[PDB]
C-alpha cells in the first residue's frame, strides 16, 4: 500500500540547506516526504537521477535538453510558471543587459567582457551564443565551441566552463580558491542574479540573463534606468521593453524525472502539496519560491508562481519545441549541415512501404527532399513538431490534430478532376470527396438502419471518410460513447489491439502487426477497408465513392481484386434507401475535405515552392512521371498521396485548419472528442497553452 519518498538532488550547501528546510516543513505539514541527495552540479544530478541515485531536479530549458539525450533519457514532469504581469507563462524571454553609456550594439560584442549565467543554459549560453555564431568565425565541432567564445570575449564568467583549457571563460568569475567558476551557487556569479551582479559590480559589460532578473534586483525605477537591453536589431531599448528587445523566448525550467519508473506520480503530489502549502504567500513558516540573499534560485526560481503538470507523451524534444531544438542542435552541427537542412524538405513517411517510396523520391530529386519515418501518423506529426520532419499529406481528420498543435495546411490534394483539365488543377477550387457506406448487393437485408451488431471495416480511427463521419452520425443516433459495442466486430487500424475494433484486422502477410494504423495492415486505408469488404471479413465498409470504382471491374488486378465488379456493390443512403455505387452523389454520408499537406507556418512558403517544382517534374503531368517517378502513383496502395491525385493545389484562402475543414466538421469532431481524446491532442493542449 505505502509509497516511498521523492529524492531531490541538490547542487550546493546552500541548496541542501534549503532542501532540508523543505523536508522539515513538509513533514511538519504531515504531507508527502522528501529526501535530499547532494551532488555538485545540475549536470551531475542528471546523471544521478538516471542511475536511480536520485529522482528529481529542476533544470533550465538548456539542460532539459541534455538530460533527454540518450544515455540519460529523462523527461520533464512539471514546468515552472512565471508572471511578469501578464498571464503567468511557461515561457520567458532571454535578454542581454548592459549599462547605459557603454555604446556597444549587439553586433559589436567582439572584445567585450561578458557575464553568463552558466554553460548550457538557455539565456546565459545557448541563445546568445547561437545569436553570435556568425561573428565567432568558428570552424564547427572539431573545434570546441568553448574555444571560440573564449577568443571572442576579452574575458567572461561562464560557470561550468573548463577554466583550465579555457581560463578566459572563467576569468571574470569571483570565487575562492576552487570555488571560482563553480557550477553551483558557490560561484557568486552563477545564475540569473549572479550574472547580473557580475554586470553591476563592473566585472563584465554585458549580462546575458532572464527578462525579470533586472526588476528582481533593482526594485526601483530610478536604478533600472541605469541599464538597457541590446536588441537583435542593433539598437538599445529600456529594460522594460524585453517584449520587443529579446534575443529569444524559451520554455520555462522544469522538473525532470526518469523516463521509466520515475515516479512521476510521487513527484507531482509532492509539488502540488508544496505550492498549496508554501507557494506564494500561502505560508510564513516556509516559502518554497524564496531563497537567501547571498545565493538566489535555490531548488526553484525565486518568485515562480508554481507548477503545471506536463502531460505523459511529452518528452524533452516536444517540450522544447522546434524553434529551440533547432538552435540548440545547431550549435553542435557544421554551417554546411545547418544550411543544408534549411534548404531541403524532410517528408515524414508513415510505415515501411511509404519510406520505400519516399526514398525513391529522395534519390530522384537529387535530395532536395529527404525522408523521416514513423509507425504512425501521430508520431509523424510529433516529428514535425520537434522539427525533425517538415511535412506530410494528411486526412481531414488529422488536419484537425495538426491544426490543434499549430500546424497549418500548405497545399491541398486535387483528385483527378472533371470540368476541364481547364486551369491546371493548381488553381482549381478543391472540391472534396464523398464519404460513403458500402455493402454487397448480395446482403440486401442490410440497411443503414440495420448496422447495429453487424461487422464493420474502417479506413482507420481518426480519419474522415471512415471513423469521424460514420461514428459522428451514429453517436447522434445512439448517444453512446461505447464505440466498441455498436458494431459486433470490426477492423479499424489504430484502436486498442484487444478491442472488438481490431477483431477483423489482418496485419501483414505473415499476420504480424495486426491493426497497426499504416500500410503494413493489409485491411488499412480506403483500399484496405474496401478489401475487408470484398474478402467478406466485414459486412459494411466506410470509404469514399471512388475507392470502389478503382478496385472493381479489373482496374486493380491484385488477386482479391481482379474479379470484382461495380455491379457487386451498392451504397447505404441515410434514408434507409440503397443506390448503385454510381448514385453516390445522391447517397452519401458526407462531403469531406480533400487531404492536405501541412507544415509549421514558418516552413510553409519554402515547402510550397519545393512542392510546386517536384510535382511539375513528377506530378500528374510529370515529364519524368512514367519515365522515372510519379509522385502520385503507387500501385493502388495510395502511398504518400492518393493514387488519383492530379496535383497539389492552392487553399483558396482557407489557410487555417478551421477555415479549411470548415465550421461543421470542426464542430462534429469536437463533439466526438467528448467521448474520446488522443494523447497527441492533449500534449498539444498544454504546449499551445
Ligand atoms: O464542400 C466540401 C469542402 O470541404 C472543405 O471546405 C474542403 O477544404 C474543400 O476541399 C471541400 O470542397
Ligand atoms: Fe535559464
Ligand atoms: Fe480520409
XYZ file of C-alpha atoms and ligand atoms in Angstrom:
703
model
C 0.000 0.000 0.000
C 2.675 2.583 1.096
C 4.627 4.642 -1.493
C 8.175 5.971 -0.788
C 9.941 9.364 -0.815
C 10.991 11.674 -3.640
C 14.772 12.054 -3.617
C 15.567 15.626 -4.666
C 19.080 16.265 -5.928
C 20.857 19.444 -4.742
C 23.999 21.094 -6.148
C 25.493 23.131 -3.277
C 25.390 23.546 0.540
C 23.018 26.451 0.199
C 20.743 24.263 -1.894
C 20.918 21.331 0.523
C 20.065 23.589 3.462
C 17.006 24.931 1.629
C 16.091 21.374 0.744
C 16.329 20.328 4.380
C 14.165 23.256 5.471
C 11.846 21.974 2.716
C 11.826 18.386 4.084
C 11.422 19.657 7.646
C 8.347 21.796 6.942
C 6.857 19.131 4.677
C 6.814 16.567 7.469
C 5.505 19.243 9.853
C 2.539 19.713 7.489
C 2.102 15.970 7.506
C 2.300 15.704 3.736
C 4.486 13.856 1.132
C 8.021 13.063 2.284
C 11.121 14.494 0.624
C 14.778 13.481 0.819
C 17.896 15.471 -0.076
C 20.789 13.953 -2.017
C 23.877 16.111 -2.669
C 25.887 16.122 -5.867
C 27.794 19.120 -7.227
C 26.129 20.385 -10.392
C 22.902 20.181 -12.296
C 24.799 18.052 -14.812
C 25.652 15.644 -12.034
C 22.095 15.346 -10.752
C 21.044 14.499 -14.295
C 23.485 11.563 -14.086
C 22.481 10.785 -10.505
C 18.780 10.704 -11.395
C 19.219 8.313 -14.359
C 21.217 5.882 -12.215
C 18.445 5.780 -9.612
C 20.676 7.580 -7.120
C 18.017 10.391 -7.091
C 14.622 11.185 -8.631
C 14.147 14.861 -9.432
C 15.872 18.134 -10.380
C 14.715 21.479 -11.635
C 16.543 22.211 -14.920
C 16.691 25.244 -17.283
C 15.465 24.566 -20.839
C 19.047 24.003 -21.903
C 19.836 21.169 -19.519
C 16.441 19.547 -20.035
C 17.894 19.100 -23.457
C 20.991 17.058 -22.490
C 19.075 15.375 -19.718
C 16.936 13.943 -22.515
C 19.943 12.864 -24.589
C 20.199 9.136 -24.990
C 22.340 7.775 -22.128
C 20.044 9.523 -19.658
C 16.607 9.710 -21.301
C 14.997 11.880 -18.641
C 11.750 13.729 -19.249
C 10.134 16.977 -17.973
C 7.435 16.246 -15.434
C 6.359 19.716 -14.295
C 7.059 23.106 -15.749
C 7.567 26.179 -13.591
C 5.086 29.032 -14.094
C 6.287 32.646 -14.102
C 4.338 36.005 -14.307
C 5.919 39.317 -15.230
C 2.411 40.792 -15.195
C 0.663 39.037 -17.901
C -0.785 35.670 -17.992
C 1.623 33.630 -15.894
C 3.643 31.865 -18.536
C 5.507 28.692 -19.073
C 7.889 30.617 -21.290
C 10.244 33.537 -20.797
C 12.323 35.913 -22.867
C 16.115 35.709 -22.817
C 17.758 39.121 -22.899
C 21.118 40.920 -22.978
C 21.518 43.597 -20.300
C 24.107 46.378 -20.378
C 24.813 49.661 -18.570
C 23.887 52.902 -20.355
C 26.787 54.798 -21.907
C 28.593 51.644 -22.994
C 27.973 52.217 -26.656
C 28.095 48.635 -27.981
C 25.289 47.253 -30.078
C 24.680 43.510 -30.376
C 26.981 43.289 -33.422
C 29.982 44.822 -31.672
C 30.497 42.495 -28.689
C 33.895 41.350 -30.013
C 36.346 42.043 -27.214
C 33.800 42.886 -24.572
C 33.820 41.372 -21.080
C 30.742 39.184 -20.593
C 28.838 37.559 -17.769
C 26.982 34.311 -18.431
C 24.572 32.502 -16.141
C 26.218 29.135 -16.854
C 27.394 26.785 -19.643
C 24.481 25.131 -21.382
C 21.671 27.337 -20.076
C 19.114 28.986 -22.348
C 19.525 32.692 -21.635
C 23.080 32.514 -20.430
C 24.555 30.421 -23.197
C 22.584 28.525 -25.868
C 20.719 31.519 -27.105
C 23.223 34.350 -27.035
C 26.000 32.156 -28.422
C 23.745 30.921 -31.207
C 22.977 34.537 -31.948
C 26.652 35.444 -32.157
C 27.808 32.348 -34.069
C 28.004 34.395 -37.268
C 30.653 36.545 -35.568
C 32.638 33.815 -33.830
C 34.217 32.782 -37.136
C 34.157 29.142 -35.751
C 35.032 26.003 -37.728
C 32.394 23.820 -36.147
C 32.639 20.772 -33.754
C 36.215 19.559 -34.499
C 36.840 22.850 -32.794
C 35.269 23.092 -29.308
C 32.705 25.892 -29.130
C 34.117 26.788 -25.745
C 37.344 27.643 -27.682
C 35.677 30.296 -29.822
C 33.641 32.105 -27.217
C 36.926 32.239 -25.312
C 38.691 34.028 -28.229
C 35.643 36.187 -28.873
C 35.169 37.752 -25.432
C 38.019 39.533 -23.620
C 37.138 37.631 -20.554
C 33.987 36.072 -19.250
C 32.410 34.301 -16.335
C 30.795 31.187 -17.639
C 30.237 28.906 -14.679
C 30.796 25.222 -15.544
C 33.381 26.080 -18.277
C 36.880 24.426 -18.446
C 38.631 27.212 -16.590
C 41.671 25.018 -17.249
C 41.836 24.742 -21.016
C 39.849 27.935 -21.481
C 40.605 30.291 -18.497
C 39.380 33.263 -20.472
C 35.901 31.805 -19.866
C 36.325 31.708 -16.073
C 38.489 34.786 -15.604
C 35.816 37.307 -14.530
C 34.429 34.759 -12.111
C 34.650 35.739 -8.450
C 35.002 32.744 -6.181
C 37.518 31.486 -3.628
C 40.363 29.118 -4.422
C 38.493 26.275 -6.139
C 35.025 27.806 -5.704
C 35.919 30.088 -8.659
C 33.901 29.292 -11.813
C 31.916 26.671 -9.867
C 28.853 25.111 -11.437
C 26.874 25.998 -8.318
C 25.849 28.980 -6.247
C 29.313 28.614 -4.731
C 30.472 30.745 -7.631
C 28.853 34.074 -6.751
C 28.328 34.856 -10.388
C 26.218 31.694 -11.318
C 22.600 32.072 -12.323
C 20.424 34.970 -13.444
C 21.224 37.111 -10.438
C 24.851 36.025 -10.401
C 25.322 37.201 -13.969
C 23.586 40.439 -13.064
C 25.901 41.217 -10.171
C 28.879 40.414 -12.387
C 27.491 43.265 -14.501
C 26.622 45.783 -11.682
C 29.926 45.147 -9.916
C 31.647 46.201 -13.175
C 33.301 42.850 -13.909
C 31.523 42.452 -17.256
C 29.982 44.800 -19.831
C 27.006 42.662 -20.813
C 24.833 40.348 -18.740
C 23.137 37.569 -20.621
C 20.011 36.836 -18.485
C 16.213 36.471 -17.999
C 13.564 39.171 -18.559
C 12.716 39.582 -14.856
C 16.215 39.494 -13.451
C 16.726 43.303 -13.743
C 13.454 44.014 -11.936
C 14.245 41.352 -9.360
C 17.451 43.004 -8.231
C 16.556 46.630 -8.785
C 13.048 47.243 -7.282
C 13.264 50.974 -8.032
C 12.654 52.560 -11.462
C 15.464 55.011 -10.789
C 18.161 52.361 -10.590
C 16.891 50.289 -13.537
C 17.211 53.436 -15.696
C 20.940 52.968 -15.319
C 20.609 49.869 -17.501
C 19.469 48.949 -21.073
C 18.898 45.931 -23.366
C 20.743 45.132 -26.613
C 18.050 44.333 -29.207
C 18.775 41.883 -32.028
C 18.311 44.802 -34.380
C 21.415 46.609 -33.190
C 19.672 49.230 -31.107
C 19.216 49.642 -27.379
C 15.888 49.783 -25.639
C 14.918 50.183 -21.933
C 14.791 47.214 -19.639
C 11.027 47.061 -19.541
C 10.969 46.584 -23.317
C 12.107 42.931 -23.277
C 8.891 42.110 -25.024
C 10.373 43.938 -28.069
C 14.090 43.701 -27.310
C 14.664 39.939 -26.795
C 17.256 37.504 -28.242
C 14.692 34.737 -27.902
C 11.722 33.308 -25.993
C 12.485 29.994 -24.356
C 10.316 27.448 -22.436
C 10.415 27.584 -18.620
C 12.691 25.484 -16.468
C 11.354 22.159 -15.466
C 11.379 19.306 -13.010
C 12.673 16.230 -14.770
C 12.482 12.553 -13.815
C 13.387 9.174 -15.353
C 11.522 8.008 -18.484
C 10.897 4.612 -16.975
C 9.967 4.137 -13.348
C 10.481 7.791 -12.458
C 7.590 8.055 -10.005
C 6.040 10.946 -11.916
C 3.099 10.430 -9.557
C 5.211 10.857 -6.427
C 6.872 13.956 -7.759
C 3.632 15.619 -8.756
C 1.905 15.061 -5.407
C 4.892 16.483 -3.614
C 4.868 19.619 -5.767
C 1.084 20.017 -5.638
C 1.288 19.946 -1.813
C 4.241 22.307 -1.885
C 2.557 25.105 -3.868
C -0.662 24.680 -1.849
C 1.304 24.817 1.375
C 4.323 27.090 0.735
C 3.546 28.753 -2.580
C 3.176 32.496 -2.944
C 2.017 33.911 0.398
C 0.288 30.672 1.348
C 2.660 30.275 4.393
C 5.172 32.155 6.565
C 6.869 29.129 8.168
C 8.485 28.265 4.828
C 8.487 29.847 1.441
C 9.145 27.470 -1.423
C 9.776 30.114 -4.033
C 12.102 32.331 -1.946
C 15.801 31.947 -1.074
C 18.614 33.579 0.892
C 20.156 36.852 -0.419
C 23.682 35.502 -0.805
C 22.509 32.817 -3.214
C 19.372 33.052 -5.397
C 17.205 30.462 -7.181
C 17.684 27.586 -4.791
C 15.880 24.426 -5.869
C 13.454 26.648 -7.951
C 13.397 30.152 -9.471
C 12.570 32.606 -6.741
C 9.126 34.084 -7.281
C 7.802 31.437 -9.659
C 4.023 31.182 -9.274
C 4.144 27.379 -9.012
C 3.954 24.359 -11.338
C 1.835 22.832 -14.016
C 1.926 19.133 -14.765
C 3.423 18.143 -18.079
C 1.290 15.504 -19.790
C 2.624 11.986 -20.471
C 3.669 11.568 -24.172
C 5.583 14.926 -23.941
C 9.349 14.347 -23.978
C 12.142 16.974 -23.941
C 12.059 17.453 -27.704
C 8.362 18.282 -27.813
C 8.635 20.230 -24.593
C 11.348 22.495 -26.000
C 9.810 22.743 -29.464
C 11.266 23.049 -32.942
C 12.395 26.675 -32.590
C 14.509 25.856 -29.551
C 15.562 22.379 -30.670
C 16.905 23.625 -33.946
C 19.022 26.461 -32.463
C 20.449 24.110 -29.809
C 21.136 21.193 -32.168
C 22.553 23.854 -34.497
C 25.349 24.735 -32.029
C 26.576 21.164 -32.492
C 26.426 20.955 -36.280
C 28.507 22.480 -39.068
C 27.482 25.552 -41.059
C 27.113 23.342 -44.112
C 24.933 20.901 -42.125
C 22.580 23.690 -40.997
C 22.180 25.449 -44.308
C 21.765 22.019 -45.893
C 18.756 21.023 -43.771
C 17.233 24.507 -44.128
C 17.120 24.129 -47.917
C 15.878 20.591 -48.235
C 12.493 19.330 -47.179
C 12.068 16.319 -44.969
C 8.890 14.387 -45.604
C 7.539 12.058 -42.962
C 6.622 8.636 -44.271
C 4.149 6.602 -42.232
C 5.179 2.978 -42.285
C 7.648 0.810 -44.279
C 6.024 0.964 -47.724
C 5.960 4.808 -47.553
C 9.648 5.224 -46.630
C 10.453 2.986 -49.642
C 8.567 5.330 -51.991
C 9.916 8.336 -50.149
C 13.446 7.055 -50.583
C 12.735 6.772 -54.333
C 11.534 10.352 -54.245
C 14.662 11.464 -52.418
C 17.139 9.763 -54.777
C 15.273 11.005 -57.820
C 15.168 14.641 -56.650
C 18.974 14.840 -56.029
C 18.000 15.083 -52.338
C 16.007 18.341 -52.381
C 13.731 16.045 -50.469
C 14.805 13.727 -47.670
C 12.762 11.327 -45.566
C 11.762 10.715 -41.998
C 9.572 7.833 -40.857
C 7.314 6.695 -38.014
C 4.989 3.741 -37.394
C 2.022 6.078 -37.045
C 0.614 9.355 -38.270
C 0.626 10.881 -34.768
C 4.343 10.141 -34.452
C 4.979 11.859 -37.751
C 3.104 14.948 -36.547
C 5.230 14.909 -33.381
C 8.378 14.655 -35.531
C 7.147 17.699 -37.380
C 6.672 19.498 -34.036
C 10.151 18.567 -32.787
C 11.421 19.933 -36.100
C 12.825 16.619 -37.395
C 10.455 16.415 -40.347
C 8.955 19.167 -42.421
C 5.633 17.825 -43.570
C 3.202 15.182 -44.697
C -0.055 14.724 -46.534
C -2.911 14.288 -44.005
C -6.558 13.303 -43.981
C -9.065 15.912 -42.847
C -9.307 14.160 -39.533
C -5.630 14.573 -38.825
C -5.539 18.064 -40.278
C -7.608 18.734 -37.145
C -4.999 17.350 -34.814
C -2.195 19.041 -36.754
C -4.178 22.265 -36.549
C -4.666 21.982 -32.827
C -0.900 21.646 -32.481
C -0.254 24.752 -34.578
C 0.500 23.280 -37.994
C -1.174 24.886 -40.996
C -2.326 23.365 -44.290
C 0.010 24.361 -47.145
C -1.341 22.832 -50.380
C -4.354 20.554 -50.908
C -4.834 17.319 -52.891
C -6.929 17.888 -56.021
C -8.252 14.463 -57.190
C -8.171 13.823 -60.996
C -10.787 16.319 -61.918
C -13.817 16.745 -64.065
C -14.855 20.082 -65.633
C -11.823 20.505 -67.815
C -8.188 19.938 -67.073
C -9.080 23.804 -67.546
C -6.641 25.592 -65.412
C -4.106 23.024 -64.274
C -5.646 21.884 -61.119
C -3.306 24.114 -59.075
C -5.915 26.888 -59.116
C -8.969 24.687 -59.216
C -11.040 25.084 -56.070
C -10.629 21.890 -54.062
C -13.991 20.147 -54.338
C -13.525 17.436 -51.700
C -14.831 13.886 -51.750
C -17.938 11.931 -50.842
C -17.736 9.627 -47.851
C -19.804 6.511 -48.400
C -21.072 3.358 -46.728
C -20.519 0.236 -48.869
C -22.049 -3.270 -48.600
C -22.591 -6.118 -51.077
C -25.574 -6.126 -53.495
C -25.916 -9.619 -52.099
C -26.809 -8.861 -48.476
C -29.995 -6.914 -49.429
C -31.282 -7.460 -45.894
C -28.782 -4.775 -44.799
C -29.775 -1.069 -44.484
C -28.034 1.878 -42.620
C -30.739 1.434 -40.091
C -29.545 -2.183 -39.562
C -25.797 -1.698 -38.992
C -26.344 -2.452 -35.283
C -24.436 -5.592 -34.397
C -23.037 -6.044 -37.866
C -19.330 -6.224 -38.876
C -17.516 -3.059 -39.875
C -14.460 -2.181 -41.928
C -12.942 1.282 -41.306
C -10.072 3.003 -43.038
C -8.726 3.728 -39.553
C -9.551 5.654 -36.390
C -9.309 9.410 -36.638
C -9.971 9.585 -40.348
C -12.789 11.449 -42.097
C -14.464 9.153 -44.634
C -14.191 6.215 -42.238
C -14.414 6.853 -38.441
C -15.141 10.626 -37.933
C -18.054 10.791 -40.348
C -19.920 7.484 -39.716
C -19.180 7.405 -35.972
C -20.217 11.026 -35.892
C -23.626 10.265 -37.326
C -24.061 7.134 -35.198
C -23.150 8.778 -31.925
C -26.005 11.183 -32.775
C -28.480 8.268 -33.070
C -27.366 6.206 -30.041
C -25.979 8.861 -27.689
C -23.489 6.224 -26.605
C -19.723 6.717 -26.261
C -19.146 2.981 -26.235
C -17.880 2.919 -29.840
C -16.561 -0.611 -29.445
C -20.034 -2.064 -28.857
C -22.169 -0.821 -31.772
C -20.646 -2.990 -34.496
C -20.321 -6.630 -33.403
C -16.737 -6.880 -34.609
C -14.723 -4.534 -36.747
C -11.335 -3.709 -38.156
C -10.216 -0.161 -37.542
C -6.431 0.184 -37.548
C -5.317 2.343 -34.653
C -7.674 1.015 -31.978
C -6.877 -0.917 -28.765
C -5.387 -4.216 -30.084
C -7.563 -6.094 -27.576
C -10.849 -4.375 -28.508
C -13.508 -5.614 -30.943
C -12.497 -2.696 -33.193
C -9.369 -4.688 -34.074
C -11.102 -8.027 -34.410
C -11.350 -8.214 -38.209
C -7.950 -6.703 -38.939
C -5.335 -8.941 -40.566
C -1.724 -7.468 -40.234
C 0.921 -8.116 -42.983
C 1.261 -11.247 -44.912
C 2.813 -13.231 -42.068
C -0.029 -11.912 -39.909
C 2.158 -9.595 -37.790
C 1.241 -6.058 -36.680
C -2.491 -6.647 -36.651
C -4.463 -3.376 -36.534
C -1.438 -1.071 -36.772
C -2.508 2.214 -38.365
C -0.355 2.138 -41.521
C 0.166 0.242 -44.809
C 1.646 -2.850 -43.062
C -2.001 -3.739 -42.093
C -3.483 -5.070 -45.365
C -7.031 -4.121 -44.455
C -5.831 -0.471 -43.742
C -6.976 2.585 -45.685
C -9.592 3.237 -48.320
C -8.219 0.301 -50.206
C -7.802 -1.829 -47.127
C -11.273 -1.091 -45.813
C -12.863 -1.904 -49.134
C -10.930 -5.165 -49.293
C -12.074 -6.090 -45.819
C -15.464 -5.971 -47.548
C -14.558 -7.937 -50.687
C -12.862 -10.720 -48.704
C -16.121 -10.792 -46.683
C -14.372 -10.167 -43.365
C -16.792 -7.322 -42.756
C -20.358 -6.514 -43.771
C -20.172 -2.705 -44.308
C -17.207 -0.560 -45.343
C -16.699 3.124 -44.782
C -14.801 4.693 -47.658
C -15.156 7.281 -50.408
C -17.214 6.742 -53.597
C -14.163 6.498 -55.861
C -12.472 3.690 -53.819
C -14.927 1.136 -55.102
C -14.605 2.348 -58.677
C -10.805 1.989 -58.544
C -10.719 -1.639 -57.439
C -13.670 -3.236 -59.234
C -14.014 -4.025 -62.945
C -10.427 -5.290 -63.062
C -8.656 -1.950 -62.597
C -6.862 -3.367 -59.598
C -5.524 -6.739 -60.657
C -4.303 -7.885 -57.261
C -5.818 -11.404 -56.757
C -8.568 -10.362 -54.307
C -9.469 -7.568 -56.721
C -9.319 -8.814 -60.287
C -12.819 -10.365 -60.486
C -14.788 -7.725 -58.588
C -17.499 -5.607 -60.265
C -19.097 -2.162 -59.776
C -22.175 -4.291 -60.028
C -21.472 -6.424 -56.870
C -21.628 -3.333 -54.631
C -24.240 -0.781 -53.572
C -24.296 2.120 -51.082
C -26.473 2.638 -47.988
C -28.192 6.024 -48.055
C -29.125 7.787 -44.863
C -32.802 7.434 -45.624
C -32.663 3.633 -45.500
C -32.525 3.589 -49.304
C -29.801 1.859 -51.413
C -28.281 3.103 -54.697
C -25.636 1.688 -57.074
C -22.098 2.830 -56.387
C -22.670 5.350 -59.161
C -25.540 7.232 -57.447
C -23.271 8.257 -54.571
C -23.967 11.965 -55.268
C -27.488 11.241 -54.030
C -26.478 8.629 -51.480
C -23.575 9.782 -49.308
C -22.935 10.205 -45.568
C -20.934 13.387 -46.129
C -18.857 15.749 -48.241
C -15.236 15.614 -46.902
C -12.235 17.965 -47.284
C -9.570 16.665 -49.679
C -6.457 15.595 -47.740
C -3.780 18.188 -47.301
C -0.105 18.777 -46.792
C 0.691 20.532 -43.525
C 3.799 22.073 -42.018
C 4.832 24.666 -39.469
C 3.593 28.093 -40.684
C 7.285 29.038 -40.845
C 8.255 26.427 -43.443
C 5.031 26.748 -45.486
C 6.242 29.052 -48.274
C 9.515 27.186 -48.904
C 7.595 23.900 -48.696
C 5.219 25.190 -51.361
C 7.982 26.194 -53.785
C 9.792 22.852 -53.484
C 6.491 21.053 -53.959
C 5.389 23.034 -57.000
C 8.654 22.078 -58.669
C 8.752 18.484 -57.509
C 5.230 17.851 -58.798
C 5.861 19.691 -62.057
C 8.746 17.258 -62.565
C 6.956 14.053 -61.347
C 3.314 15.101 -60.965
C 0.235 14.061 -62.889
C 1.668 15.678 -65.975
C 5.192 14.948 -64.909
C 7.500 14.662 -67.938
C 9.546 12.198 -65.983
C 6.467 10.625 -64.368
C 6.012 7.342 -66.241
C 9.698 7.707 -67.047
C 11.500 7.876 -63.663
C 8.981 8.623 -60.802
C 5.334 9.532 -60.447
C 4.754 11.272 -57.188
C 1.065 10.482 -57.286
C 1.092 6.775 -58.127
C 1.861 3.682 -56.090
C 0.101 0.586 -57.372
C -3.282 1.362 -55.634
C -1.618 1.400 -52.230
C -2.142 5.180 -52.019
C 1.373 5.739 -50.608
C 2.319 9.314 -49.578
C -0.684 10.759 -51.528
C -3.808 9.328 -53.106
C -3.261 7.493 -56.429
C -5.914 9.606 -58.118
C -4.164 12.840 -57.235
C -3.770 15.159 -60.184
C -1.902 17.916 -58.417
C -1.494 19.699 -55.087
C -3.499 22.937 -55.331
C -3.817 26.312 -53.569
C -6.072 26.574 -50.481
C -8.284 29.311 -51.915
C -7.763 31.396 -48.799
C -8.685 28.567 -46.437
C -5.271 28.855 -44.722
C -6.134 27.871 -41.123
C -7.416 24.418 -40.180
C -10.761 25.842 -39.123
C -11.116 27.702 -42.405
C -10.062 24.604 -44.404
C -12.049 21.854 -42.652
C -14.933 24.257 -42.290
C -17.351 25.098 -39.469
C -19.457 21.946 -39.319
C -16.870 19.191 -39.392
C -14.656 21.002 -36.944
C -17.619 21.066 -34.547
C -18.568 17.464 -35.264
C -15.029 16.405 -34.498
C -15.252 18.270 -31.202
C -18.478 16.565 -30.167
C -16.726 13.230 -30.772
C -13.820 14.330 -28.504
C -16.493 14.342 -25.746
C -16.147 10.559 -25.923
C -12.502 10.062 -26.689
C -9.427 12.257 -26.903
C -5.918 11.470 -28.195
C -2.674 11.798 -26.223
C -1.229 13.972 -29.023
C -4.329 16.201 -28.753
C -3.605 16.674 -25.070
C 0.125 17.115 -25.311
C -0.620 19.931 -27.698
C -3.271 21.407 -25.410
C -0.518 22.004 -22.879
C 2.160 23.145 -25.320
C -0.202 25.536 -27.172
C -1.350 26.639 -23.723
O -17.680 21.038 -49.537
C -16.536 20.276 -49.174
C -15.315 21.157 -48.974
O -14.851 20.925 -47.623
C -13.708 21.723 -47.274
O -14.051 23.062 -47.400
C -12.523 21.379 -48.191
O -11.424 22.229 -47.900
C -12.900 21.535 -49.664
O -11.857 20.996 -50.463
C -14.217 20.814 -49.988
O -14.656 21.188 -51.286
Fe 17.644 29.814 -17.740
Fe -9.851 10.111 -45.424
